[PDB]
Amino acid sequence: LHKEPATLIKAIDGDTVKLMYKGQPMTFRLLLVDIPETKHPKKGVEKYGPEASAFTKKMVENAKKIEVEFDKGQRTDKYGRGLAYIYADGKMVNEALVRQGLAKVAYVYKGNNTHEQLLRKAEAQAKKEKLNIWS
Secondary structure (H helix, E strand, C coil), X not given: CCEEEEEEEEECCCXXXXXXXXXXXXXXXXXXEECCCCCCCXXXXXXXXXXXXXXXXXXXXXXXXXXXXXXXXXXXXCCCCEEEEEEECCEEXXXXXXXXXXXXXCCCECCECCCHHHHHHHHHHHHHCCXXXXX
């Protein structure tokens, strides 16, 4: 896997970020995480969704360096979002969210599983600490 530079344009949600990637604007879905979504057809703003969205926001807004890492499977979903691991100053946003108890590890989508064990590891620890969603 290779990291590539990107530039923040806008954080959208705990799990979606808009980035300037290779000269063009692109929406990215974070790989292997499932959030208590704030963007839902008809709900009330899911429990921990606001905190997850704020966490992602602060992490990418505060970073000096954003990098994108595509996995070896399919690179976009049916909505045209890039499927990737995102790093903020060398730290994986996907893993931080899970480690902090602000996301669960999702099912593997189309061969994209390189950091699955790493994330499952992080999720175990958050559950063990009864963090946030696991409280």
